[model samples]
Target: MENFQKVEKIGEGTYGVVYKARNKLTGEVVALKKITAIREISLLKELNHPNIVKLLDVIHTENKLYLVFEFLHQDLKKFMDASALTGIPLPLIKSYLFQLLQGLAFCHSHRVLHRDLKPQNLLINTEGAIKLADFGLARAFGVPVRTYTHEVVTLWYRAPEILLGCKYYSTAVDIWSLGCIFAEMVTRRALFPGDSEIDQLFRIFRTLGTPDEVVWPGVTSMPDYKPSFPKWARQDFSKVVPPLDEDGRSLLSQMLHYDPNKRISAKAALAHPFFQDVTKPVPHLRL
Candidate 1:
C-alpha cells in the first residue's frame, strides 16, 4: 500500500516543495509535503470542517516528514484559467464560496488564521468538493494584541491593512482575501495584479480609491501609510466585475472594506444575501 513514486513537482510552500506522487498498485495520486521538522504540522490537525482540508496520513522517519493529502483533480486557479476569463459558472462559484466560508468561519471561530487565502490554495475534487490547503504560516490570534509578520498573505489577495503595516490584525485579514478571491471567480482574473508591494497598494488604491480619514476613519496611522500617494477616486466595482449581481456586489464591498475593523467576518459573510438563493449546480472542472 505504501509503494510510491515521486511523479513531479506540483507546487512549493514556505517549507519546501510539494511533489505529486502515485501508488504503483492503485495509481492513486497524492500530494507529498516534504518537511524538515513538525513545527506547525499541527496546523493541519487543528482545522477540519467542510472544504477545510484534512491530511490522509503523515510519515516521520529518516529525519524527515511526508504529509499525504488527497490529490484533488485541480486547484481553483487552474480551473479558472481553463475557463479562460469567463471562469467557472456562477452556481459553481457560489457553491465553492459557501464551502470556503464554512471552512474559513470554522478557523476564525477557533482563533486560527489561514493567512494566505487565494484561488491557488483552494483545491477542488471531482465530487464538487473544495478543500482549504497549504498552511504555510500559522498563528492563533487572541484578545491580547501582538505584532505579526506583514509578509503573511500574497500581494493581490492580501488585505490593505496588513499592506499598510498594521501588524495587529485579526481574522478580518482572511476576509479581505476572500473578497479578492470572490471577484476573481467572477472575472477569471486577479482583481489587483501588481508587480510589487508598493505597486500593489497603488493597484488597490486606484481601484478602491486611496483610503483616507474621511472614508476610512483612522486610516492614515498605519506604519506604511503615506500622505502623498495618488488620490485616485474610487470606482464602482460593476466596471471591474460586471457579472456580479446587486446582492453579491453589496457583499463584496463589505468584504473589501479598507479598515479591517469594518471588513465583514466570514460568519457574517456566510449569511449575506449572496448566499440566499443558491444557484443551480454546474458541471465540475477537470483536466
Candidate 2:
C-alpha cells in the first residue's frame, strides 16, 4: 500500500471515497478508491475508456482493494453548475457534447449501460474534456435495472421504460439519460424536473407526450403504465433549447425519442451533422 501515497480527498468518486494519491514508483498522481463492492471492481477489471474515464490501475496487492484512476478536478455536475450560471457558449458546448457522444459511443458498443448519467457521472478533466463515470455501476444483461425508492438522486435521468418498471433495460435508455444532460448543458436547466416516480412520468409525458402502442409499442403492458394519464403531444424541442442550431436541435431530438428501441445509437449520434466540424481530442489517456 505504501507504493501509493494518499494525497487528499478529491470527493465521492463514481463508487467510493476518492483520494488524490501519488504513485511513489512512477511519480504519477491518481485517484485512489478503497474497495467497498466486489461487483464494481469486477467491471473495472473489464473494458476501459476515452470518452469514459479510464480505470488507471487496480489493486489486490493489499486486502483493502485500492483502485487507481486519473485524478479529475471536477464532475460535469459542478462544471456546468459553475459555468452555466452565465452560460457555456455554443462553440464550447458543442465541444463538450461531441466528446460526450464520443465517450458514449465507445461504451455502448460493448453494451455496458451506465443507465445513469446526470452530469454527476460525467467527469471533467482540467483540459475541459468530458468523460463518463460510474459505468461499472451496472452491467447490461440478466439483472434488469436497479430498484428506486427515493434512495438515490439519479431520478432525473430515467427514461420511461426504466421508471415504469420495464423488465429489461436497453442501451438506448442510456441515450435517453445522456440526452437529458445534453439539454441541460445547452439550457442550464433540467429537461424534466419531476419530484418523484409518478411526477417524473407526468413531467416527461406532459412535455414529450404520453406514449401509446404507436408511439412506444407495448407501453401499456409495462407494469407502471396508467391508462388515465393525461395525454400530450410532443412539444417542439427546438423551442426548449433556443440557442441550439438546426443540426444540434435535430441531434438532441434523435436522442430523446420516446421509443427506447428506436433512439439513435451512439455510433449514429456521433455521426450526426451536429459534429461535422468537431475535431477529436487525444484526452491524454494512459501514462
Candidate 3:
C-alpha cells in the first residue's frame, strides 16, 4: 500500500484482491489487500502480531482502501491438499501449534474473535513459520454475553455450540477451531467431513456424543437445538483421528469439548502437558 511494487495477483480474499508485492524501500516482499469496503479498513489497522499476518500500512484512494501485509508463500490448505508435509516431523507440528496459540492468545486478549478459522487462514513463510490470516469475519467482543448472529466458521471446523446456534459464545469458539487444526495437522485431512450444518453436528455427535443441559447448560435455549438424536455416551476420538498419539488425542478432546465453558483457553492450551512435554523455543526468523 505504501511504497510497494505489486508483483502479481495472488487471489480473491474474503473482502479484497490480494497481490504479491515488494517494498520499494526495504525490498521486503508483502501482500497488498485492496478492500472495496472502506468500513473494514479499521479492522485491519487494529491488528498487529508476529504469528498473525502483519498489517504494515494502509493506502487510501477514493474507491478502495489498500492494506499491506507481510507476504507468506502459501497457506496450510494448499499445502495439505498437495501432500506437502508427507513424513513431517512431530516437533514441527508442535512448533506450529505453539506459535498459532500464541497468536490466538493475543487476539483473544484484545477481545477480537476470529469467527472463520480454518487451515486456509493459516499461512506459512519461507522458513516453515506459520501465521494466522484472514480476519474478514472477525468481531470484537465487549463486556456481558450476547448472542452473536451469523454462523461464520467452515462446516468441518465449527464447534458444537455454534452448530446449535448458541448466542452467547466466547473464546471457546476459537479453541474448537484449533482442535480441528490440530487434527488436520496430525492426519493430513479434515477431522470431520461435514458438508452441511446438520451433517456437522451429527458427525460430532457420533464422535463425542450428544450434549445435554447437565453437560452444557443452556443447550435447550439454543436456536437449533433438537431433543432426539442417535447418541454415543463417550468420546470416540480414536475414530476421528486414528493416527494421533494419546497425548495428541487428549489435546484435541480438551479443545473440542462439547461444553463451551469447559473448552480450553489459548493460554491454558499452551500450558497443557502435551505442549510442556514437547516445548522448544521457536527460532528467530526475518519477515
Give all candidates' CA lDDT scores. 0.78, 0.75, 0.75
State how far residue 50 of model 1 sits from its true place (Å): 2.5
**Tens digits of lDDT, candidate 1, 206-267:** 98998899878888887999888889999898897887999889999999988788788889
Give, for candidate 2, the lowest lDDT window spanning 10 residues.
140-149
Largest TM-score belongs to which candidate?
Answer: 1
Q: TM-scores, in order shown?
A: 0.86, 0.85, 0.83
Candidate 2 achieves a global lDDT of: 0.75
lDDT of 2 by residue, 1-287 (tens): 68989888876543457788999999998878764455655666566767777787677764566777776777777767787567666676777888877777777787677777778767777565788866656552222223332234657888888888887878888889888888888899988987788889989887788889998888889898889888887788777887788998898888988778888988898789988887544332221
Alpha carbon deviation, residue 264, candidate 2 (Å): 0.5
Question: 99, model 3: CA deviation in Å?
Answer: 1.0
After superposing candidate 2 on the true structure, give the runs of residues whose Cα lies further than 4 Å from its correct spot. 35-40, 60-65, 140-151, 279-287
Q: What is the C-alpha RMSD of each candidate to the true structure, in Å?
A: 4.9, 4.3, 5.3
Q: How well does candidate 1 score on lDDT at residue 264?
A: 88
RMSD in angstroms between candidate 2 and the native structure over all alpha carbons: 4.3
